[PDB]
Design a protein around this ligand. Sequence first.
Ligand SMILES: O=C1CC(I)=CC=N1
Length: 165
Amino acid sequence: SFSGYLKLTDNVYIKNADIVEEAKKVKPTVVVNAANVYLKHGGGVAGALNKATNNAMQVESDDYIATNGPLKVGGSCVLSGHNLAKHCLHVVGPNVNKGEDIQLLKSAYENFNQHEVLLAPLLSAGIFGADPIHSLRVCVDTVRTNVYLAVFDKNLYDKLVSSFL
Ligand SMILES: O=C1CC(I)=CC=N1
């Protein structure tokens, strides 16, 4: 299963790792994508996960959007995990850089509760513009299922562990 994770709470674990590399090594049941409402996997975690699937995630996502329309901010959808996981839970955290409401971060993390165990990034962190310390606090206070957080940035990882209440 997952290795080298630091236990934060009863159910939240954290590691300084590239989520693509974590997914290829573990091949978890669920890998969470930091998605936008259009499932346009351009940059950040989404661009990286999609590129690891040789664009298969984008092809599948475009078919999903053609059929169903866009997701809601705070919403999610379950798609194939391709070569990374059994499934990919595409979760839309609020993008602060696009003026979206940070209050929706709790709704976004609520999606994780429908899955027993997940490999995930910190929602709304990185290019989404929210404070990662706040995202980790919402995560531990919202997610009740087992979440293995992969934090790409080492300096951020250290700051998150050292400041965790
Ligand atoms: O290139 C990337 C970005 C991020 I954020 C996580 C993993 N790979």
